Amino acid sequence: QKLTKLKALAMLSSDALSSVAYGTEQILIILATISAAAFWYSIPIAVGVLILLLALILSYRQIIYAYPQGGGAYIVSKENLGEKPGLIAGGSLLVDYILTVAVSISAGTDAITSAFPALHDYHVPIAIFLVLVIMILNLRGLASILAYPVYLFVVALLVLIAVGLFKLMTGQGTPVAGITLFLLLKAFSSGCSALTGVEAISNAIPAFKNPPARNAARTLAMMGILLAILFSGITVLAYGYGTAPKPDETVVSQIASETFGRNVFYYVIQGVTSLILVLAANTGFSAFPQLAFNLARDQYMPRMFTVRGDRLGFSNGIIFLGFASIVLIILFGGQTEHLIPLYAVGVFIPFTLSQTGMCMKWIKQKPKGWIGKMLINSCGALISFMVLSILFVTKFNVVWPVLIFMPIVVLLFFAIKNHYTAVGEQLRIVDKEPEEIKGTVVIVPVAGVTTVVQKSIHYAKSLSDQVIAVHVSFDREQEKKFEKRWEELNNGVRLVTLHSSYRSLVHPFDKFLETVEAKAKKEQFSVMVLFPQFITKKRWHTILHNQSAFLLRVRLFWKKDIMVATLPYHFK
Amino acid sequence: QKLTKLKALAMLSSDALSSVAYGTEQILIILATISAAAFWYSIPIAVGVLILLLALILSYRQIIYAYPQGGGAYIVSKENLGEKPGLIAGGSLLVDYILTVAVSISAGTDAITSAFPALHDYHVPIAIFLVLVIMILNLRGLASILAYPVYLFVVALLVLIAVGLFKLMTGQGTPVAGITLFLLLKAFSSGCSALTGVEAISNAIPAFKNPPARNAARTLAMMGILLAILFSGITVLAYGYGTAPKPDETVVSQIASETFGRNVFYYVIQGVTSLILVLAANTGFSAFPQLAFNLARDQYMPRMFTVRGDRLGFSNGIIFLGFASIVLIILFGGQTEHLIPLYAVGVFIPFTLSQTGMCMKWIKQKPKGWIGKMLINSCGALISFMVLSILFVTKFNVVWPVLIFMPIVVLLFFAIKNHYTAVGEQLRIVDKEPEEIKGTVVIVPVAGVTTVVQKSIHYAKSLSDQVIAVHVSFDREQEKKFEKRWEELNNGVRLVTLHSSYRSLVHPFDKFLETVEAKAKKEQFSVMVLFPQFITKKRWHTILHNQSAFLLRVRLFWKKDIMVATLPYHFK
Ligand SMILES: Nc1ncnc2c1ncn2[C@@H]1O[C@@H]2COP(=O)(O)O[C@H]3[C@@H](O)[C@H](n4cnc5c(N)ncnc54)O[C@@H]3COP(=O)(O)O[C@H]2[C@H]1O
Ligand SMILES: Nc1ncnc2c1ncn2[C@@H]1O[C@@H]2COP(=O)(O)O[C@H]3[C@@H](O)[C@H](n4cnc5c(N)ncnc54)O[C@@H]3COP(=O)(O)O[C@H]2[C@H]1O
Ligand SMILES: CCCCCCCCCCCCO[C@@H]1O[C@H](CO)[C@@H](O[C@H]2O[C@H](CO)[C@@H](O)[C@H](O)[C@H]2O)[C@H](O)[C@H]1O
Ligand SMILES: CCCCCCCCCCCCO[C@@H]1O[C@H](CO)[C@@H](O[C@H]2O[C@H](CO)[C@@H](O)[C@H](O)[C@H]2O)[C@H](O)[C@H]1O
Ligand SMILES: CCCCCCCCCCCCO[C@@H]1O[C@H](CO)[C@@H](O[C@H]2O[C@H](CO)[C@@H](O)[C@H](O)[C@H]2O)[C@H](O)[C@H]1O
Ligand SMILES: CCCCCCCCCCCCO[C@@H]1O[C@H](CO)[C@@H](O[C@H]2O[C@H](CO)[C@@H](O)[C@H](O)[C@H]2O)[C@H](O)[C@H]1O
Ligand SMILES: CCCCCCCCCCCCO[C@@H]1O[C@H](CO)[C@@H](O[C@H]2O[C@H](CO)[C@@H](O)[C@H](O)[C@H]2O)[C@H](O)[C@H]1O
Ligand SMILES: CCCCCCCCCCCCO[C@@H]1O[C@H](CO)[C@@H](O[C@H]2O[C@H](CO)[C@@H](O)[C@H](O)[C@H]2O)[C@H](O)[C@H]1O
Ligand SMILES: CCCCCCCCCCCCO[C@@H]1O[C@H](CO)[C@@H](O[C@H]2O[C@H](CO)[C@@H](O)[C@H](O)[C@H]2O)[C@H](O)[C@H]1O
Ligand SMILES: [K+]
Ligand SMILES: [K+]
């Protein structure tokens, strides 16, 4: 259960070092708006990205040591920056998860269509299909499938880089007009979408070896080095071959095809890239609940997320995350180019907030060597904020959804916090002992003389006396037959048959319950209803059974403050 | 509650006579594939459609008399053709409802964009938005809004027809190569999508005046005459002005603009058409549950639909119908042209089955004048089957989804029927009285000393003795504080504190429940758990509260055959 360095790197790096499939492509797409001759500018810009990457790693190398409990960006932003910055970081992490699912799936389908161009008319269905698949694979459960594909991806891309560099060596500057500083910055910001998951390792510190902090930091350093090597090699290869971004083929696919030649090696590369992107999406799915629990300990998210041991909130979280990702995929049509700016925003707001909190914490404490750590975090935060500002300013026509999504989730967090605050305020205070109860009348609603009915009557009689059976009859003809059949049973239970012409079920019970509750209140008795819970071993018969019980519970019995037992009954 | 003829026509005709907005358009679109000079062929084809319409009306004029209880196509296909034809009719009616929602909404948005061309880039969002709106308006409840717009539509289109005919009179043959018989039949089949809701009146016979059959038949005849007049007038006007189908404007919009001139009259026409199409979609929504109940009486659909008086199944039905319609809208991009063939298939399978059943019933009985009724139904069935065959053969690339949807729903119906058959078989048989119970031990899970906890303890003590409180503690530190606070309460209840390191909640309860259940079984006691049901008056705090209770119920207590009371507690 204590992952070693290699296995931990495999399980947690599938999000970060899987972004090399669409980073250099973004850089080249932005540069191509001027001319194909500007592609050499990818070489410096890429270097700048690595510089940023270095800062991030160093910054997070601090965070892991400062917060060995885990937490990550949310905790750092909460403790050191207050409550609103922490909530903003949480919302941005939610956007990060939704967008990493969407972007990873879209890029995977782009890789697949590059492998088989005949599916270019099904970019969106395939994508959505894949999403649903992993949703199921997360509802069903779910460890080897998350560890080998990353090794395969790293090995395959290292082989591809080596072969491409060898071919370039065997042969198998220049300023260009139009490139202004602003467009260079735009390209750099778009290319910073290669640093889209270095967060993950800092969020899973406990699942490490005996020293958790040291092992996590060394794993993060190794992952950073691997990502830097892969990204630099891919960018160098792309510059070497030219490889302008085609509208129906990824840059990696073009590089592989011009290197190996659409043979088994190329298909291996494409399949492995698709697999690693799917694993990245699954990483987003699996990383959401950790954030949910971290928020829920502070009463910002439902208490149902605080039970982490039983995966209480995993179903709702997985369903909501999958549906949000599907909605985003449909909205942008699976265009990885049009989705990446939003993903970068959702990733870089937490980066900025986390580095700012780190810097202010260092300022507050001022330990030995505080100046260097402060400088590193400050530089990282400045660069990240610049990238975020550029992404807002330029690609607003695809970043508009975050400007709507952030206020909604922040307000939801505040509303939940206020609600739990009020509830905890007025519930903790204890009070006087309630009115005495001298007995209990049990009402058993019956839909027909069955085995389940007789079992429930038996338990009701065991529980207390005064048991009365109640039957709402939709037709006056079957009243006599049902009453006779009940009399055939030798139960000493008074049966009250009451009629409803309009096939309604609540209102006749409303009247009867009024009468019975008044009568019981005269004798200080507590009315109580005993429903059977028919259970079958199919998990899809739930809609087929005992729904009238839920109707009566929800619409009548909760409003009347009446105990409602639910005796289960299994089916063979 | 007993609708008069006029009000009934208004409430039920919003589906049938709202199809004039896209029938002549389909005829013209099919004819335009040859040349604009072939548009005169719309005049004969339209006439043929009316002939078909006449048959349908006559056929249904019989059905209303033969089945005054209602039912409609499903009952006719069930009694006279067997079980599988009845199920096929039911599935096709489900497709009819989904497609009428989708098509009506799409045509409404087409009318809106014709009114304001600036929204042509939002055909699908607007559409989906409208759908969601009516979904809400069907979950909230929902009678005058369903009665006046139909009157407005009829009046407005009658005015438009009169004005257009007047202008044609004041002036304000010719065989064409390429028109083969097959293409004429294709155009006729596509134009038969004007008869897309004459079914509705036959499905709501009881809600009429003192003679239900006569009043329903006369209302159906009046609606048929109105539809014939509107459709014929629209087709004549379209032929008179030429009005080739533009890619960004409905034929009705073109007719109105060339008649009135984009003034307040034209905007009134467009708005009224949009309103009538929205009402048609709402008619589909409201008509689904009648089919659901009719199926459920025969154990083909969940029993939860048999309680028609309390609208038990309306929530699930509305949600599923809305989501299916939204999926179809997105799939075909709100192209009313591409959706109509599927709608016509889903409407005409029931027409064919119903007329065939009517004919065979007449053959079996052979009453006076049987020959004429048999001939009418036979002719209607033959024409409908021909139209359906043509729609399958030609427009397969948009009718493929029904070929997938039909087997799934038919198999679901059969599976549900088999399941209820087995359950009813093995449940009715009564058996020996179960083991005696000599008392009851009550387990009260507590999450902290609160008012709710003390109320639940009070009720548990009232219910029986041997009450024991149980607390799972996620941290050993707060164990002592919680135990001391419990001791501060003077409850004579033994508190068992048990610890779970991984924040799990089921497993410690699993062990404790094993021990307690064994101990109680030694004394023939029945274990029982008492949960509080925290209730707030906001309907959206449901996710915020008492979810651990649902976790414990679902994952632990149903599997152990243990009674689980649920005492409600209201919030102030
Ligand atoms: N003959 C049969 N064929 C198929 N399934 C059968 C069946 N008899 C019982 N069941 C299954 O058992 C569930 C509970 O049956 P019971 O009548 O004990 O429990 C009923 C009864 O306690 C009460 N209830 C239902 N209809 C009622 C009525 N018309 N009048 C009074 N109480 C009614 O609500 C509970 C829920 O009933 P619901 O029908 O939702 O759920 C039923 C159904 O799922
Ligand atoms: N201080 C507070 N702040 C905000 N809301 C509060 C609150 N105290 C109680 N509530 C509300 O009351 C519900 C039931 O509280 P109770 O502890 O009686 O009912 C609990 C208790 O009977 C049992 N349970 C929950 N956690 C437990 C634990 N750690 N150990 C043992 N039983 C537990 O499951 C029931 C469901 O509890 P859940 O927390 O889902 O739902 C809670 C929550 O919605
Ligand atoms: C809950 C309320 C909050 C807001 C409501 C929810 C959103 C409402 C409208 C959203 C959709 C409107 O916008 C609709 O979708 C996208 C917008 O990105 C457009 O489509 C375009 O999206 C982006 C833009 O380059 C591309 O990736 C895509 O290929 C392109 O087709 C559609 O042509 C437009 O019709
Ligand atoms: C059971 C698992 C299998 C999955 C089942 C679900 C199937 C998919 C559900 C609906 C998918 C909708 O797919 C929708 O199709 C429309 C056309 O109708 C596509 O159509 C559009 O695609 C993009 C823009 O978005 C353009 O390149 C293309 O020219 C345009 O036609 C949209 O890209 C997609 O949003
Ligand atoms: C509660 C508040 C609600 C929030 C806002 C509600 C709706 C907001 C959705 C905004 C629409 C998205 O904006 C979307 O942008 C893309 C380009 O990026 C447009 O895409 C379009 O560009 C041009 C210019 O219109 C079109 O001619 C072309 O057909 C298409 O590619 C979509 O037509 C537009 O819909
Ligand atoms: C339990 C599920 C069982 C399997 C379900 C059946 C599988 C269905 C596969 C869905 C494939 C999606 O199909 C996708 O949309 C339609 C099919 O109508 C095709 O294209 C169609 O819609 C497009 C896009 O709106 C329109 O231009 C036009 O109406 C038509 O060409 C798309 O080119 C195809 O990409
Ligand atoms: C709160 C109520 C408001 C509704 C909120 C929901 C907003 C809508 C959710 C996503 C809608 C998706 O809208 C999707 O946009 C894509 C482009 O991205 C559209 O794009 C496509 O439209 C059709 C083909 O389908 C072509 O005419 C168009 O050229 C093409 O771009 C698809 O038609 C539509 O399937
Ligand atoms: C159980 C699994 C069920 C089978 C799974 C697949 C179900 C059927 C989906 C495949 C057919 C999709 O439906 C079909 O999509 C193709 C591909 O866009 C569309 O094809 C049309 O548009 C595309 C896109 O421009 C053109 O390339 C093509 O030449 C043209 O014919 C058809 O108009 C649509 O009818
Ligand atoms: C337009 C497309 C046409 C409509 C789509 C196709 C409709 C028909 C396809 C479904 C046919 C189902 O075929 C049905 O399968 C169910 C599954 O248990 C079984 O149905 C059988 O159920 C049990 C025995 O098991 C018998 O009580 C019942 O009388 C019998 O019908 C039989 O195998 C067959 O009756
Ligand atoms: K990534
Ligand atoms: K219609």
Residue numbers in the entry:
A (entry chain B), B (entry chain A): 22 to 163, 167 to 196, 207 to 606
What text comes from the article?
As a member of the amino acid-polyamine-organocation (APC) superfamily it has the classical LeuT-fold with the first ten transmembrane helices (TMHs) adopting a 5 + 5 inverted repeat. KimA is a homodimer, stabilised by the swapping of the cytosolic domains with respect to the transmembrane domain.
The two TMDs are tilted towards each other, forming a dimer interface at the extracellular side that would enforce a bending of the membrane by ~130° against its natural curvature. As speculated for the preparation of KimA in SMALPs, the tilting likely was caused by a loss of lipids between the TMDs during purification. A comparison of the resulting structures of KimA in DDM and in amphipols with the previously reported structure from SMALPs25 suggests that all of them represent a similar inward-occluded conformation. The potassium ion is coordinated by Tyr43 (2.9 Å), the carbonyl and carboxyl of Asp36 (2.8 Å and 3.3 Å, respectively), hydroxyl and carbonyl of Thr230 (2.9 and 3.2 Å, respectively) and Tyr377 (3.2 Å). Each binding site is formed mostly by the cytosolic domain of one monomer: One of the phosphodiesters of c-di-AMP is coordinated through two hydrogen bonds and a salt bridge between the non-esterified oxygen atoms and the amide groups of Gln581 and Ser582 and the guanidinium group of Arg337. Arg337 is the only residue of the TMD that engages in a strong interaction with c-di-AMP, making it a prime candidate for the transmission of the inhibitory effect of bound c-di-AMP.
